Amino acid sequence: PIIKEPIDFINKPESEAKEWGKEEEKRWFTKLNNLEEVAVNQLKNKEYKTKIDNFSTDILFSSLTAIEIMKEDENQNLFDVERIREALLKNTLDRDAIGYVNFTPKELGINFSIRDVELDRDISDETLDKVRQQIINQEYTKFSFISLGLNDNSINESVPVIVKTRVPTTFDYGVLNDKETVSLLLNQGFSIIPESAIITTIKGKDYILIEGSLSQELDFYNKGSEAWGAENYGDYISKLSHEQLGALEGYLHSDYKAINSYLRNNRVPNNDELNKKIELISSALSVKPIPQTLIAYRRVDGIPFDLPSDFSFDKKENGEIIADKQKLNEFIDKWTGKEIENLSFSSTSLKSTPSSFSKSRFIFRLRLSEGAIGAFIYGFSGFQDEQEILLNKNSTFKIFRITPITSIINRVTKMTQVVIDAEGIQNKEI
């Protein structure tokens, strides 16, 4: 008995959301130690929140070596991230919560304009339809902590989309306060999946209002998961023919240079014996197709983009190395929506940042869908630490978002890099 309502402060007095917020902050803080409190409290300053959010993203795409160097150097940014995560784990929702998640159009893979008409204040149905066709049922990951603004004061008027969602009861949360807005803080790594969108008018301005489902795409970032390989590809070798296993072993140890060249050159000159091997490798890789949807990583240099190998997104300003924004913007603008081919078999890993690829700055964050032709290389000598998933030849991807990051390479070295979210599409014809 007594029907329980979700936390929903939309269209309620700001003073009610603020006082709920102060109270919720007080309840939260009784469960935290002093170092958690200091790390959470600093989030009141919008500069440090932006800085800690960006850092929380950076470390997912930094090598475990680099993370360990930071921990042993007592890096306070890393400790702060850790303490905020820890604070969040102590505090769970007793009700669903409704509000607005902090995604801008860029973070939904949208680089085109939204308010196109009447002196850039109104939105065309044509544009709404374009946004719908691109975003509905796509999945967009918030790598950092995600913020849920609880009323209309959280809406930035210059940002022409609003993403509204519901957070389920039992989820971990914190509460943050400035003068006029109240927000929940949730864990890193949630995604939004847009389900619908409409044009709405709020206080005299037009927005695309997107209803989005909160989601969790299986993804191990830099930690990887050997367990995922063992559980899904434990019996893999037991299912291969002697011929499949020999061909795949050959590919992994001694044949790969020749097979990769042959496929990358459209099989010219013809070579019947590579044709046999290749057929067997594709065959082996179809024996146990990827069983659920997950993220796998492939780090590359500039060459796939027709750029110099050592293309760099970093420039010097008063001797400080910072991102070159105009290069990031150019690249994001051009490559969002483009397809990327793999004429040979291609290697990925469940680990985002194997330290031998730490300087390859083009990070493919590949959605491997259920049924994709590929295999985790589990059970093969010399391949325990790679956490390789080998993809079938002609695995074609479409890029749907590109997110700039700052990867931490070592104590003295940071590099601007890009996380390229891509999805599987029809094998490129050949």
Automatic annotation (TrEMBL):
Transmembrane segments: none annotated. Residues 17-211, 226-426 form the ADP ribosyltransferase domain. Gene3D superfamilies: Toxin ADP-ribosyltransferase, Chain A, domain 1. InterPro entries: ADP-ribosyltransferase, Binary_toxinA_clost-typ. It holds the Pfam family ADPrib_exo_Tox. One of its GO terms (cellular component) is extracellular region. This is C2 toxin (Component I). It comes from Clostridium botulinum. The lineage of its organism: Bacteria, Bacillati, Bacillota, Clostridia, Eubacteriales.
